[PDB]
């Protein structure tokens with residue numbers, strides 16, 4: 001039997017702010033769809049008592065179980081619903097019925113940072129340093145919570161009402177190599193220990209991503225562009241990248257310190273928040 | 285400018301067997317579609333002079349260039365078109381026009397081994413040992429050709445007319461982590477050197493895959509089934525798996541020798557072909 005009794009909040013919340021009232025679908029008005037993912041259909045929704053606007057994601061138990069990702073979904077909901085930070089997309093709670101799982105999510109109205117990046121072509125130093133400050137703050141909170149997988153690529157960053165970053169959890173079901181097989185776990189078995197060990201090398205890797213992200217913010221494209229997989233792997237492992245002429249000395253300093261091959265040499269998150277280029281240009 | 289003058293065959297071939305006749309679309313009758321992939325539409329086709337049946341894949345230059353995978357496609361065509369082996373899907377040649385690239389492929393009529401596995405639930409020892417022999421022979425030829433990426437997962441194995449294995453090249457454009465960004469390379473940049481180094485640990489990894497595949501053939505599912513990514517990574521790196529009661533002593537011996545954590549301890553391809561369980565049950 002597949003248990004949908006998650007270790008996650010399912011109590012009704014009074015947004016105007018012994019067994020308790022649980023969520024139900026009848027608690028929500030439904031608006032237009034916000035998007036469709038691999039397993040989720042996201043709708044604009046409104047809790048009826050408070051009229052509070054949020055996002056409701058509907059997933060289907062049958063296809064979750066058929067793809068073998070139901071246990072991963074449970075883990076994501078339990079993990080995400082216990083993170084509380086202004087720059088982390090809030091998961092308020094969940095409920096389920098005979099065929100569906102419902103996730104009650106913070107609504108982020110201004111799209112992803114990746115789309116904003118594509119619209120503006122590139123970000124100036126003030127917005128870049130402000131985004132980096134927000135992500136460094138969120139990443140410090142996350143390490144405090146010992147969260148498994150981190151992803152701060154711009155396509156995983158949503159934008160709040162006042163333009164604040166919201167780290168999302170897109171692509172939770174597709175971390176395994178792509179394939180046409182039914183279940184979304186099997187292809188991992190074909191990775192030998194030598195390769196899977198790289199996926200467990202997870203600590204100072206958020207510092208690397210921070211440097212790549214700062215580069216992509218300022219330049220508009222990531223720094224290790226190559227024509228084939230093997231070339232790209234070599235560019236990354238040997239940290240072979242250059243800056244366009246307009247990138248300033250302070251920006252170059254921070255990015256080059258974050259993109260050190262030796263993880264030991266990468267700065268701590270505290271040093272990023274104290275970096276002179278960050279404090280000079282960040283509005284936070 | 286994007287060059288479509290590949291270092292790959294484009295001369296007309298006389299299948300009944302100084303500038304030369306080049307392929308053209310008018311050389312082929314087109315039949316029903318065989319499938320649609322991410323960038324390719326595959327059709328049953330027939331060369332008109334010889335009436336030889338093959339598979340024609342049409343790709344579109346605009347979407348290849350938009351996704352930034354045109355250079356990778358060129359590399360795959362150049363690599364694949366120089367491999368010549370009875371168990372490797374032949375790429376006979378290519379041509380192109382103003383908007384499209386055409387790949388002339390060996391037609392494999394009996395589907396993928398993954399589908400056959402799902403139909404039969406599991407394979408007996410004779411078919412298993414025969415498939416493993418064919419793949420070990422093909423992998424020896426490949427190392428002789430120093431081919432970059434190897435993939436022998438059952439969903440990447442097509443079946444010839446008499447049931448012979450044909451190693452395909454499915455999913456060539458999606459080796460990077462999945463994302464909603466336009467270009468299919470950028471997400472690699474966010475992998476630090478410590479993780480990308482695992483993707484370059486490529487030699488005795490075909491021996492690992494051979495063991496996983498032999499297990500999945502005989503059992504019907506891969507050996508490291510877990511409920512979450514992190515559990516799965518631990519199961520793989522610590523090689524924690526068991527056999528159902530029906531798996532024979534010879535099968536257990538070969539699989540356990542192939543699934544050693546230390547790559548040095550994994551047998552050579554020659555030893556696999558000489559293994560007593562293989563020779564006892566392989567019809568080849």
Ligand SMILES: Nc1ncnc2c1ncn2[C@@H]1O[C@H](COP(=O)(O)OP(=O)(O)NP(=O)(O)O)[C@@H](O)[C@H]1O
Pocket residue numbers: 034035036037038039040041042055057089105106107108109158169170171172173
């Ligand atoms: N909280 C949200 N606020 C606003 N828009 C959202 C929110 N969550 C998702 N969206 C939109 O809906 C789209 C699909 O989201 P999502 O369903 O999470 O995709 P996914 O990564 O495939 N995960 P899943 O569907 O669960 O497999 C996103 O690309 C956004 O445009």
Ligand SMILES: Nc1ncnc2c1ncn2[C@@H]1O[C@H](COP(=O)(O)OP(=O)(O)NP(=O)(O)O)[C@@H](O)[C@H]1O
Pocket residue numbers: 318319320321322323324325326339341373389390391392393442453454455456457
């Ligand atoms: N040579 C072939 N013989 C028979 N069937 C084939 C052949 N090539 C492809 N097919 C079928 O067509 C489907 C799609 O193939 P393909 O286009 O290679 O998928 P893909 O992995 O997404 N590669 P691409 O489309 O180039 O991005 C496969 O799942 C097969 O069912």
Ligand SMILES: [Cl-]
Pocket residue numbers: 228229230231359432
């Ligand atoms: Cl490559």
Ligand SMILES: [Cl-]
Pocket residue numbers: 239259260261262
């Ligand atoms: Cl370095």
Ligand SMILES: [Cl-]
Pocket residue numbers: 075148512513514515
């Ligand atoms: Cl996990």
Ligand SMILES: [Cl-]
Pocket residue numbers: 523543544545546
């Ligand atoms: Cl071992």
